Structure 1
Amino acid sequence: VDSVYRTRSLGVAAEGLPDQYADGEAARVWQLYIGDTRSRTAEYKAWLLGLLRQHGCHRVLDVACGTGVDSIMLVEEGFSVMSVDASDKMLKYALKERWNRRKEPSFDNWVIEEANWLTLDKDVLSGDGFDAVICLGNSFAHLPDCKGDQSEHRLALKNIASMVRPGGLLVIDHRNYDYILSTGCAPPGKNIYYKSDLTKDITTSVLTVNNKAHMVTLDYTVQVPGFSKFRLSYYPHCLASFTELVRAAFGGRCQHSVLGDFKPYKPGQAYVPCYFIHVLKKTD
């Protein structure tokens, strides 16, 4: 018999009613988690603001923009910023803060739109390109290897990369997964961008498929006014592999450096970085 009746389809919405799982438990802890960006680190403000300024970057695209924190600063410092993301749940908060602050011209002129790394080319009229494209805070890693061959990773970078104007920069990052795969632990409270305020506990689960590392899945355990859980997954980009992927994205025509945590990275140095930042420039 074993059918499966449902009161509404997965994905739809009705007017008096909270959507899908929006009122649930994981969702409400996870809303604390993403709203955990109040102290932006001064080091990071210094570094990115100085990276852009140093290369004369003024037109910037923030791909994977989230609630928009990184973008809010860019906007604040007089940049010209377009911000995209594929997730409405997070874009809601960019959109919100933008309305909230609509009187400010800098912010009236802020563009927030939906777009998807896999279709980025058709989803953002790039014009003759952007000065900087930033994808920070380790979000590229949310893109999973569904097809098995990393062809998606490849297309996502190719698309992102193509957003970048000649002589422009792509500033893209990932957690040091080399280390995570090594300790088998993804340390909490190590976010170099926004020092975290939530006290939170973390179990790390690593899936290895036919002896190639395939997923890191983090289950967070947070305290409220309470012990609530939620789970997120990541693709573990070892530093070599990502280096290759991202280079190939521009064909090969690039200046390419890779940062420690904002300081440079000499392979075999005593200090172990928590993130690797890839700053890429182009051709001509």
Structure 2
Amino acid sequence: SDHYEEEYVLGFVDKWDELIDWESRAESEGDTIINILKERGVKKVLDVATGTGFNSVRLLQAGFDVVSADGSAEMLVKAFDNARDHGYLMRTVQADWRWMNKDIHDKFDAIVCLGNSFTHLFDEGDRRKALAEFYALLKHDGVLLLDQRNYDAILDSKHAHYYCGDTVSVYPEHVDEGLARFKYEFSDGSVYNLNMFPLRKDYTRQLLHEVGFQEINTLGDFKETYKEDEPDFFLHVAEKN
């Protein structure tokens, strides 16, 4: 059922937050995103993939005005209570990427679409539609920050990637040009298997260019515990202009 697919992922993010505390994670991940926004003079930020709220809370802590959107009401409840626990009032809004301005009536200096969330779309029409909705919600001089795993390295290898020391391993069980299924195994024995679309770096860049973004800088980001020559993530910094 749709309820189970949703409950499965809610269980996954529960487990991630259970075993990986946000302070350790913040000190580990660093402040590159915050500084990018600061250097641009960003004030208003829309988080379009809030999840359990880590990125939104970090931005609130940094002093940004943040609106926290997610397709999932249940995610937003977790995110709100996590923000609350850290001493912030989150502004949550349930929203589908295909109609983002249904209940969002402001425009923003920046949008963040992080957590490798853009890969959850398996339809190209949905990809273009989502990017267009993001584009429309940006002020004339606004920016979209959108990240993704590095699938190029896998498509062109077969070993696990670890995060937060050895708290979780991520193993590509199946990868072809249309699908990547990863096995997530946590230090307590918990296992989750998740599907995502293996976006090539240049394909994502091309989609962004095609919906109207004017300059895209893609940064390599090394997040995993045991570093390789290739980054395990990319961050696209797409300026609207």
Give the superposed CA RMSD.
Answer: 2.8
After superposition, residues 38-117 of structure 1 pair within 5 angstroms as: 38=22, 39-42=24-27, 44-100=29-85, 107-108=88-89, 110-117=90-97
Of 240, 243, 255, the residue aligned with 2:202 is 240
Specify the SS of the correspondent of 2:69: strand
Shift of 1:218: 1.2
Displacement of 1:43 in angstroms is: 6.5
Q: Deviations over 1:95-147 (max 9, x none)?
A: 1123445xx5xx33x3111111111132321x2x20010111211111222xx
The structure where helix makes up a greater share of residues is 2
Structure 1 gaps of 5+ residues are 1-9, 13-18, 191-195, 263-269
Alignment of structure 1 residues 234-273 onto 2, 5 Å = 234-250=196-212, 252=213, 254-261=214-221, 271-273=229-231
**Structure whose alpha-carbon radius of gyration is higher:** 1
User: In the TM superposition, what whole-angstrom CA distance separates every residue of 1:153-203 from its partner, at most 9, and x where no partner exists?
Assistant: 111111122221111111111111101223245x4225xxxxx25633444
CA contact (8 A) 2:93 2:103 kept: no
2:188 equivalent to 1:230 = no
After TM superposition, the score normalised by the length of structure 1 is 0.73
> Can you give the 5+ residue segments of structure 2 that lack an aligned partner in the other structure?
223-227
SS of corresponding position for 2:56: helix
Change (3 A) 1:58 1:169: same
Residues 136 and 198 of structure 1: is their aligned pair in 2 closer, same or farther, counting only changes over 3 Å?
Answer: same
Shift in alpha-carbon separation, 1:20–1:168, aligned structure 2, 3 A: closer
Q: What CA distance in whole angstroms lies between the structure 2 residues aligned with 1:30 and 1:83? A: 17
Matched, 1:170 2:144: yes
Structure 1 Cα separation of the partners of residues 112 and 219 of structure 2: 14
Q: RCO (CA 8 Å, sep 6+): is it higher in 1 or 2?
A: 1
Q: What percent of counterpart residues are identical?
A: 28
Please list the CA deviations of residues 196-235 of structure 1 after superposition, one character each: whole Å capped at 9, or x if unmatched: 2563344423354xxxx111011223342xx332211111
The TM-score normalised by the length of structure 2 is 0.84
In the alignment, which residue of structure 1 is the partner of 2:161?
188
